[PDB]
Design a protein around this ligand. Structure first.
Ligand code: ZN
Ligand code: ZN
Lengths: 465, 465
């Protein structure tokens, strides 16, 4: 089972090679290869993700933005190289004039910086931090496409930071702290000395001015910002730091976030976001000039950063590491309500309890699926539910639950990777809904500390069970 | 003053003909004409909008989805005509194979329906309703582009409904009820007999089979669904109904939502969303077959619907009708905190009060701008603030406010189009923040009834004041 299997079973995506009813052709022969089609289970995940990440960034001091999907290629000529990158771009004509589907958000985020400087000049505070849940499209050959990992259109938790020399170490460190908060609180992935690695990729000093563009001073101030920040990370968490000479991009050094995972029992890297300096963009968009003239700052850095990286890719690898098991806030089905029918007259109270709880949870904004089951059917029904839909919480309502006034509620524990039984007392349907909503709020708590609000995007997914 | 002026002054957009610092070229010569670039003030509006509309639709029974931005042209060949619509499409090549930037979400939403039928068959409930905050791109000639009204890339509150004959009148009516809830609660625009018109566009019966495709039966069942629904609308609200013979699309009849507005004092239509039947798509994607075979339903309808329509266009016309005055939830600056300094020692308590209130409002997730003003500067500072930034709420903190322990708080009243003064007592900074947050929650209340949650996407926009 790969993420292609989990994504399909959880209905996060449509499988490219599933056959379209009546056409008996594959979904991929309508959509094209490497264009992930998010389905009904995946839709609420995408809105929840944008909203949580946007709000998380706004609370940490980033301006949230949305930039156009297309642009004149003048935009990418200025940025540019163009002769090279042109080749990874989807290009088209309006009206003699060359346009591209955006492959990166950077030039747009810089124009937004430039517009604010023109309007407000030095009243604009530095560091200037801009975040976008951004949608980018890039050429990939057919043989390179794989699931959600390598695709033609995808999403980044992208941000750009323009930070003076006096604050750059803190900014680098803070981005690490942001990455950790998102992993731990949104995804429930522990970030510690045993699970995490920070890798720095630096210049070869003998090659500055040639394969590494820019000045010695730029490279030294940037590499030294990464070393101090990484030294604070290691001091604080005992997280180990790896430095690779000569591995930086031509336009600046970087730091990569790397989770260490184990099979099976093989130790494997899971690469996530990056912090990437850029000596090219401040030259091409005249940012060094603009900052010097308007702010009187001579030492300034331009940073590209993501925490997750590609969201599709992140999600792909997540589905594998966690065997289809989503955190409560991101689970296609949040509460599965399972009515264990008996054949006897108690089935009426069971049916009314299940149905009322389901309605009440939907009204609180939760994603709910009701399953009609039976004493003899239960074991096989549950097994299907676990091997396919993997609801965040199972609520079992049988004769015993009705007579004893205690729900049998099974939350899936992401650390132990097991269901955990809770006994939830209730007086009636409404009281049961309140109590189930309390369990949910506890599961939502870490996401509230990131974004202020946990997203409630309700859906009735009963048809899936 | 047009929406181009308001959008720029509120920093909702970058002005195409603003000059880029140092390049002294126009922003439009990097972006291309008719590609709206949303700026820092516009970013939170876009995320808030997606989130509110998505959640509103999920609570009303729509599945929320996000579909790809690109597609093989096979997708649009099936839908199709293609020979015609090809001409409004941005087309590009991967790897010998023709792709398009999506001009409409419809075919993707139908594939998602088709995938769920293949997986779950008749367990999928009807009506099937799917909503998307969707991003579409269409060819427009340079001479056709105007502000936010007619552009090359834009957003729709798009949905598709597959509804059996037994439920179609109710679905039509409900979409009207959805449109009214969004206008009134999100936008504070009254929908009544005096402000609103419903226009139906129908076949010419003599032309069915020729300029109007499909069968008599289809057209009659659809036109009659619109007449009954419209008759319920008129019965309930006294809203008047206009019917135009021969004005339908070739593929089905429709209803348009039309607000009536007055200048100046000229009566003008403001066209919003549409409810559009389609006899083409169920043939091209074999939906009539699929529904008949899997659900045993012979009478079924396919509907395209939006409430606002183009969101950019809606927003453009809104900014004009309301002279730059956004509802609280959507205002770039939610609280402007204005410190009226005196020159004397009370300035310290004023500065600490303003600063603490600002911080406290930011921590609640609000969009805040602090302005340092003075007794003699106030009148001109306020005038600049009103003519430019138009904050949802002004909080004036001077010597009097500090000594009397009562804030001077001015909410902008969208109906009367005037500031309205409130006297907000406080004991200290924290208590003031709580009380200001209470005023905000009252202003957020209508948006909570739509979406469960009002969006808090914080920002410090002090630099704008
Ligand atoms: Zn970048
Ligand atoms: Zn449509």
């Amino acid at each position: 089972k790969t993420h292609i299997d989990y994504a399909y079973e959880l209905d996060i995506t449509v499988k490219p090679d599933s056959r379209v009813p009546v056409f008996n052709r594959e979904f991929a022969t309508f959509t094209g290869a490497g264009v992930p089609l998010f389905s009904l289970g995946g839709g609420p995940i995408r809105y929840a993700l944008a909203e949580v990440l946007a709000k998380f960034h706004a609370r940490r001091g980033y301006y949230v933005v949305e930039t156009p999907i297309i642009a004149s290629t003048e935009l990418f000529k200025v940025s540019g190289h163009i002769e090279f990158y042109r080749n990874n771009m989807y290009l088209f004509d309006i009206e003699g004039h060359e346009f591209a589907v955006k492959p990166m958000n950077c030039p747009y985020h810089i124009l937004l910086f430039l517009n604010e400087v023109a309007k407000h000049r030095s009243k604009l505070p530095l560091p200037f931090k801009v975040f976008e849940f951004g949608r980018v499209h890039r050429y990939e050959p057919s043989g390179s496409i794989y699931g959600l990992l390598r695709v033609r259109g995808f999403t980044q938790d992208d941000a750009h930071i323009i930070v003076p020399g006096g604050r750059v170490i803190d900014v680098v460190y803070d981005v690490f702290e942001e990455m950790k908060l998102v992993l731990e609180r949104l995804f429930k992935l522990g970030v510690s000395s045993e699970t995490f690695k920070v890798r720095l990729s630096m210049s070869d000093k003998s090659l500055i001015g040639k394969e590494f563009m820019g000045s010695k001073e730029e490279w030294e101030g940037a590499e030294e910002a990464l070393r101090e920040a990484a030294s604070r990370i290691n001091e604080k968490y005992g997280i180990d730091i790896v430095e690779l000479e000569g591995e930086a991009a031509f336009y600046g050094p970087k730091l990569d976030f790397i989770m260490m995972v184990e099979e099976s029992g093989v130790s494997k890297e899971w690469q996530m976001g990056t912090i990437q300096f850029d000596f090219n963009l401040p030259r091409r968009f005249r940012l060094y000039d603009v900052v010097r003239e308007e702010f009187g700052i001579e030492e300034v850095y331009i940073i590209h950063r993501a925490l997750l990286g590609s969201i599709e890719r992140f999600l792909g690898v997540y589905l594998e590491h966690r065997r289809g098991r989503m955190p409560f806030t991101l689970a296609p089905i949040q509460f599965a309500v399972i009515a264990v029918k008996t054949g006897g007259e108690v089935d009426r109270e069971i049916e009314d309890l299940a149905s009322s709880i389901a309605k009440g949870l939907l009204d609180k904004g939760f994603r709910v699926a009701v399953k009609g089951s039976s004493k003899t059917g239960l074991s096989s029904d549950v097994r299907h539910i676990e091997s396919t839909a993997k609801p965040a919480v199972n609520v079992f309502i049988g004769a015993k639950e009705v007579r004893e006034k205690v729900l049998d509620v099974r939350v899936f524990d992401l650390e132990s990777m097991k269901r955990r039984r809770l006994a939830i007392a209730y007086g009636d349907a409404a009281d049961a809904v309140e109590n189930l909503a309390a369990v949910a709020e506890e599961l939502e708590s870490p996401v509230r500390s990131l974004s202020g609000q946990a997203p409630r995007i309700p859906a009735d997914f009963s048809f899936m069970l």
